[PDB]
Design an enzyme around this catalytic site. Sequence first.
Site, mmCIF file in Angstrom:
data_model
loop_
_atom_site.group_PDB
_atom_site.id
_atom_site.type_symbol
_atom_site.label_atom_id
_atom_site.label_comp_id
_atom_site.label_asym_id
_atom_site.label_seq_id
_atom_site.Cartn_x
_atom_site.Cartn_y
_atom_site.Cartn_z
ATOM 1 N N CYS A 108 90.467 -89.166 -33.704
ATOM 2 C CA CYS A 108 91.332 -90.255 -34.228
ATOM 3 C C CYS A 108 90.869 -90.805 -35.553
ATOM 4 C CB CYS A 108 91.496 -91.419 -33.222
ATOM 5 S SG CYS A 108 92.522 -92.809 -33.771
ATOM 6 N N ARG A 111 90.642 -95.170 -36.382
ATOM 7 C CA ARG A 111 89.672 -96.007 -35.680
ATOM 8 C C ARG A 111 89.159 -97.242 -36.418
ATOM 9 N NH1 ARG A 111 85.375 -91.934 -33.609
ATOM 10 N NH2 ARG A 111 86.274 -90.560 -35.228
ATOM 11 N N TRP A 280 100.410 -97.003 -34.686
ATOM 12 C CA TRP A 280 101.484 -96.723 -35.650
ATOM 13 C C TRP A 280 101.246 -95.334 -36.307
ATOM 14 C CZ3 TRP A 280 98.503 -101.384 -36.316
ATOM 15 C CH2 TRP A 280 97.473 -101.320 -37.288
ATOM 16 N N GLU A 285 102.112 -86.898 -39.373
ATOM 17 C CA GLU A 285 102.370 -86.519 -37.979
ATOM 18 C C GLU A 285 103.841 -86.155 -37.793
ATOM 19 O OE1 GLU A 285 100.140 -89.061 -34.959
ATOM 20 O OE2 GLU A 285 100.041 -90.407 -36.676
HETATM 21 C C1 HEM Z 1 96.500 -97.857 -35.289
HETATM 22 C C2 HEM Z 1 97.157 -96.757 -35.679
HETATM 23 C C3 HEM Z 1 96.606 -95.359 -35.395
HETATM 24 C C4 HEM Z 1 96.677 -94.318 -36.241
HETATM 25 C C5 HEM Z 1 97.269 -94.289 -37.687
HETATM 26 C C6 HEM Z 1 96.046 -93.195 -35.581
HETATM 27 C C7 HEM Z 1 95.905 -91.929 -36.079
HETATM 28 C C8 HEM Z 1 95.762 -90.832 -35.256
HETATM 29 C C9 HEM Z 1 96.214 -89.473 -35.525
HETATM 30 C C10 HEM Z 1 96.932 -89.001 -36.809
HETATM 31 C C11 HEM Z 1 95.855 -88.703 -34.488
HETATM 32 C C12 HEM Z 1 96.078 -87.178 -34.331
HETATM 33 C C13 HEM Z 1 97.313 -86.922 -33.490
HETATM 34 C C14 HEM Z 1 97.647 -85.456 -33.491
HETATM 35 O O1 HEM Z 1 97.509 -84.796 -34.546
HETATM 36 O O2 HEM Z 1 98.047 -84.941 -32.417
HETATM 37 C C15 HEM Z 1 95.168 -89.537 -33.517
HETATM 38 C C16 HEM Z 1 94.637 -89.059 -32.323
HETATM 39 C C17 HEM Z 1 94.167 -89.831 -31.289
HETATM 40 N N1 HEM Z 1 94.062 -91.227 -31.295
HETATM 41 FE FE1 HEM Z 1 94.735 -92.429 -32.862
HETATM 42 N N2 HEM Z 1 95.589 -93.591 -34.331
HETATM 43 C C18 HEM Z 1 95.970 -94.916 -34.155
HETATM 44 C C19 HEM Z 1 95.743 -95.672 -33.010
HETATM 45 C C20 HEM Z 1 95.176 -95.253 -31.815
HETATM 46 C C21 HEM Z 1 95.014 -96.037 -30.630
HETATM 47 C C22 HEM Z 1 95.486 -97.511 -30.453
HETATM 48 C C23 HEM Z 1 94.356 -95.294 -29.735
HETATM 49 C C24 HEM Z 1 93.937 -95.708 -28.315
HETATM 50 C C25 HEM Z 1 93.761 -97.006 -28.034
HETATM 51 C C26 HEM Z 1 94.108 -94.010 -30.298
HETATM 52 C C27 HEM Z 1 93.425 -92.957 -29.715
HETATM 53 C C28 HEM Z 1 93.562 -91.648 -30.081
HETATM 54 C C29 HEM Z 1 93.212 -90.505 -29.260
HETATM 55 C C30 HEM Z 1 92.598 -90.484 -27.831
HETATM 56 C C31 HEM Z 1 93.618 -89.304 -30.070
HETATM 57 C C32 HEM Z 1 93.442 -87.813 -29.636
HETATM 58 C C33 HEM Z 1 94.786 -87.368 -29.065
HETATM 59 C C34 HEM Z 1 94.699 -85.965 -28.577
HETATM 60 O O3 HEM Z 1 93.560 -85.432 -28.458
HETATM 61 O O4 HEM Z 1 95.784 -85.382 -28.307
HETATM 62 N N3 HEM Z 1 94.601 -94.021 -31.574
HETATM 63 N N4 HEM Z 1 95.057 -90.838 -34.046
HETATM 64 C C1 LIG Z 2 100.444 -79.234 -27.843
HETATM 65 O O1 LIG Z 2 99.898 -80.540 -28.070
HETATM 66 C C2 LIG Z 2 98.615 -80.873 -27.698
HETATM 67 C C3 LIG Z 2 97.942 -80.145 -26.715
HETATM 68 C C4 LIG Z 2 96.642 -80.500 -26.348
HETATM 69 C C5 LIG Z 2 95.992 -81.584 -26.941
HETATM 70 C C6 LIG Z 2 96.628 -82.342 -27.918
HETATM 71 C C7 LIG Z 2 97.923 -82.037 -28.332
HETATM 72 C C8 LIG Z 2 98.619 -82.861 -29.410
HETATM 73 N N1 LIG Z 2 98.275 -84.284 -29.386
HETATM 74 C C9 LIG Z 2 99.107 -85.157 -28.563
HETATM 75 C C10 LIG Z 2 99.095 -86.613 -28.999
HETATM 76 O O2 LIG Z 2 99.382 -86.738 -30.390
HETATM 77 C C11 LIG Z 2 100.632 -87.327 -30.779
HETATM 78 C C12 LIG Z 2 101.171 -86.653 -32.064
HETATM 79 N N2 LIG Z 2 101.674 -87.724 -32.898
HETATM 80 C C13 LIG Z 2 101.536 -89.030 -32.237
HETATM 81 C C14 LIG Z 2 100.485 -88.800 -31.148
HETATM 82 C C15 LIG Z 2 99.055 -89.173 -31.597
HETATM 83 C C16 LIG Z 2 98.954 -90.634 -32.039
HETATM 84 C C17 LIG Z 2 98.634 -91.635 -31.124
HETATM 85 C C18 LIG Z 2 98.566 -92.966 -31.522
HETATM 86 C C19 LIG Z 2 98.202 -94.016 -30.496
HETATM 87 C C20 LIG Z 2 98.823 -93.287 -32.859
HETATM 88 C C21 LIG Z 2 99.130 -92.251 -33.749
HETATM 89 N N3 LIG Z 2 99.395 -92.513 -35.051
HETATM 90 N N4 LIG Z 2 99.179 -90.967 -33.323
#
Ligand code: HEM
Ligand SMILES: COc1ccccc1CNCCO[C@@H]1CNC[C@@H]1Cc1cc(C)cc(N)n1
Lengths: 411, 407
Positions: A108, A111, A280, A285
């Site tokens: 993420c 953070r 947000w 994305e």
């Molecule tokens: C505040 C705005 C936030 C932005 C701009 C942001 C940005 C991102 C982005 C761009 C990703 C990659 C998603 C992807 O490519 O699939 C991500 C992943 C992730 N974020 Fe954030 N994030 C935000 C808030 C949060 C919040 C509030 C949480 C939890 C409380 C969080 C937890 C995670 C986790 C666990 C992943 C990994 C998801 C996965 O492995 O599929 N994020 N973040």
């Molecule tokens: C085939 O897809 C998968 C398979 C395994 C692991 C992860 C993935 C992909 N990640 C799933 C979660 O990610 C989604 C993609 N855009 C929004 C969301 C991630 C996210 C979460 C939050 C809280 C904020 C943000 N800006 N972005």
Amino acid sequence: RFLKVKNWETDVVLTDTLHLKSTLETGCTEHICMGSIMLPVRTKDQLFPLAKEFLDQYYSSIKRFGSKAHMDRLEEVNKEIESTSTYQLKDTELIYGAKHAWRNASRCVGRIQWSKLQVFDARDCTTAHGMFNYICNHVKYATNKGNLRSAITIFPQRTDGKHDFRVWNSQLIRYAGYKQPDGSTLGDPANVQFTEICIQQGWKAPRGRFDVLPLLLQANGNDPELFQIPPELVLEVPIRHPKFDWFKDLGLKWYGLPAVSNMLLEIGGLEFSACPFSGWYMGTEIGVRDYCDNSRYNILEEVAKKMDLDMRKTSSLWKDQALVEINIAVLYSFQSDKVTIVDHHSATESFIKHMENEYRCRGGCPADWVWIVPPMSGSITPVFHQEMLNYRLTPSFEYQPDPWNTHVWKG
Amino acid sequence: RFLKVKNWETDVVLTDTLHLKSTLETGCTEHICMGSIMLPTKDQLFPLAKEFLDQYYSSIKRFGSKAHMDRLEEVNKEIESTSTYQLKDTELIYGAKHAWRNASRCVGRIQWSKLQVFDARDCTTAHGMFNYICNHVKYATNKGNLRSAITIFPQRTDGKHDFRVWNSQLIRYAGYKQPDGSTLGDPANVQFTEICIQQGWKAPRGRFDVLPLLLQANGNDPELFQIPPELVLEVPIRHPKFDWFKDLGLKWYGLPAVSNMLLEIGGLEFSACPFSGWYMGTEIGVRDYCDNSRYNILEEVAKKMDLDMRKTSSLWKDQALVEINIAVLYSFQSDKVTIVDHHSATESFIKHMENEYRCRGGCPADWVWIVPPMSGSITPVFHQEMLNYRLTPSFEYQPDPWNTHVW
Ligand code: HEM
Ligand SMILES: COc1ccccc1CNCCO[C@@H]1CNC[C@@H]1Cc1cc(C)cc(N)n1
Ligand code: HEM
Ligand SMILES: COc1ccccc1CNCCO[C@@H]1CNC[C@@H]1Cc1cc(C)cc(N)n1
Ligand SMILES: C[C@H](O)[C@H](O)[C@H]1CNc2nc(N)[nH]c(=O)c2N1
Ligand SMILES: C[C@H](O)[C@H](O)[C@H]1CNc2nc(N)[nH]c(=O)c2N1
Ligand SMILES: [Zn+2]
């Protein structure tokens, strides 16, 4: 031991000592790096150590380590475990836990925001209808008429693994996908399987390109139930371009609220299998992944046609050119509608500042480079040039199997 | 112990068995992934020799044959007797092609078997090294129709008689810190340029001065040579649409040629082994031109395009980036100098991976390096899981010689 990371653009060297608190394994060995692999019922015996570690961390953070209150809480959890085989978190511990799971999420980039998270304690929830209500309130709160607020809602923890709360949607808000008999897909191809489940469960599908999916909610190990999120609660942005007037006629829109609902929150050895969280969007994305992945909306061709780019040779960079215009459009549209969004330049810069702060104050910031670097324009962002150490801290967000593979149907 | 890799775009799953022969260590542990870090005697030598000769004889379908056993004995005798050994020409050619095949950070490896190997093991002086290098440069350039090549100087002996090219690449542009305060030319080469100047080079003090070669033979002090200008093919950079682009006065050289690495074959170390192929466009247009710490031309280009530079969210950097990269490819193509774009190069590499999985049981790859520094996720490699591990023969990094060498 101390580990060093260099930034190759600035020559700044940081020293990580936090990796020493890492328990969970990475998937890598001295012989293989699995750093680009996507995905690399507890006993009393394993639980008390995990509770103890967590409560020591909690009590250190509030500057009460070793206090009577710290010791009493250890003994109280000790006893609760030996007697009931599990334990309940205090509200303050749950909140702290949820924040730290985000703090520790190495994939993420967002953070910098970790300490501002609205935690909704849904541990008194007992039914799917109850979950729906909780999820509605979360969506309304987080959306806030476009001025987005990070939040998470936390449903009751795993007990015997037979009574799990699950949100079957992978995100609270997503578009349906429908495979046609000709092999083409209408809507989002990522969501075909789940859309098929929703239909089998009795959802009446509009069958358009942007149908918001119904929630499929499992409480207490029971069969999941369908609910439609009130449309007035689903904020959407029509996509248009600041100079290209034909762009709106592509008929594109996206939802404002990214809200991940299929992950597991582990705090002090307890497993919260339903813990939808939201923040947000970063523009890419939607503009890079959601729109331009070949296996998603795949609009590069149609956009490039409309821009009259030279499309006979990849070396015209027509794809790259259309990609930038779509991303400009996404950021323009969200900004014009006053829906929070961050561009990848701003998000990565902030992340670098966060990471440096984390090294000074915490002794590390675990980060997964493969995920942190944006999916366009990688090297003109400061994170490309930043060495990162990836390791696993608890509390944490973890993956878990899709529930349609594991659920014992009751009928 | 048998590992799967999945492509998330195509759902194709491949099984890797090749990693079980990995020898060297990665930097990673079960506790910590170092995937994104840039730089993570008689007794030792026979195991290494055996390991290599075994794979060599297997490759020519002669494993366990008398000719195989006889070579293993001969090499054993030579090591016991001389403390090192000499590779046969065939072994040298095989070892070199395989160091390239094993290069996990190289996207261009579909080409690995078409490598021209120049055996420079009879070289004794810096002038000899210069002659060999000019010949390499001219062969590889081939009037713009580039051909892959490596030139292999004598192997390390006691470590006090090393052959080294002091240049990081055979062809690079000088860098000078200015009274102004800023940097003229290429900021990456400032220190090497100073070493050249301190060893006698008369610098023209321009933005694009081809550096002299600085060559060390037999552990002696390095000497300066200018590469004949007529052998250094260069490309003026212009845009197919933007007439003003030429006015920036940008050029780049056609021959990418890494010269600071160490080739390890069957335990032997070739510390001077310059190799070359042809460019992927992004190496120049994204990295050389746009890195903050490089020519850093984004600001100036964006201005000429009249984009809104007030706010990052107009994506003016991204817009200018694509144009700079269109210009690079267009200019090389117009002047008939081989170049590959990142779409074509990554597509070929996916094909190469599939070949290697099918024919070899795997293909070590470093995803952090393989994914292009622009437009990552619209190239197929972004969606490709890759396993990174170290096989031998290999190209390895080695310390900059100015830190090791005593004068
Ligand atoms: C505040 C705005 C936030 C932005 C701009 C942001 C940005 C991102 C982005 C761009 C990703 C990659 C998603 C992807 O490519 O699939 C991500 C992943 C992730 N974020 Fe954030 N994030 C935000 C808030 C949060 C919040 C509030 C949480 C939890 C409380 C969080 C937890 C995670 C986790 C666990 C992943 C990994 C998801 C996965 O492995 O599929 N994020 N973040
Ligand atoms: C085939 O897809 C998968 C398979 C395994 C692991 C992860 C993935 C992909 N990640 C799933 C979660 O990610 C989604 C993609 N855009 C929004 C969301 C991630 C996210 C979460 C939050 C809280 C904020 C943000 N800006 N972005
Ligand atoms: C034929 C055309 C070739 C193409 C298109 C190509 C492509 C590339 C690219 C883009 C890089 C990354 C460079 C960087 O970002 O710094 C690279 C690295 C590398 N390549 Fe190639 N390559 C080619 C030929 C060769 C040859 C002929 C060899 C050796 C015989 C080779 C061995 C290597 C090695 C060892 C690296 C890593 C360099 C380092 O670690 O700094 N490649 N390749
Ligand atoms: C500051 O740069 C570094 C510092 C340390 C380690 C590695 C690097 C990066 N590699 C340096 C050498 O790589 C250069 C970059 N562009 C051309 C060359 C790589 C290359 C080699 C070959 C044979 C072909 C090709 N297309 N590209
Ligand atoms: C195979 C590879 O690890 C996979 O495509 C990853 C690469 N980096 C990513 N980075 C982000 N932010 N999101 C993703 O889905 C991916 N996919
Ligand atoms: C810190 C990080 O490993 C570093 O910036 C890497 C990232 N990926 C790269 N990829 C390539 N091809 N070349 C590079 O020089 C780099 N630099
Ligand atoms: Zn690793």
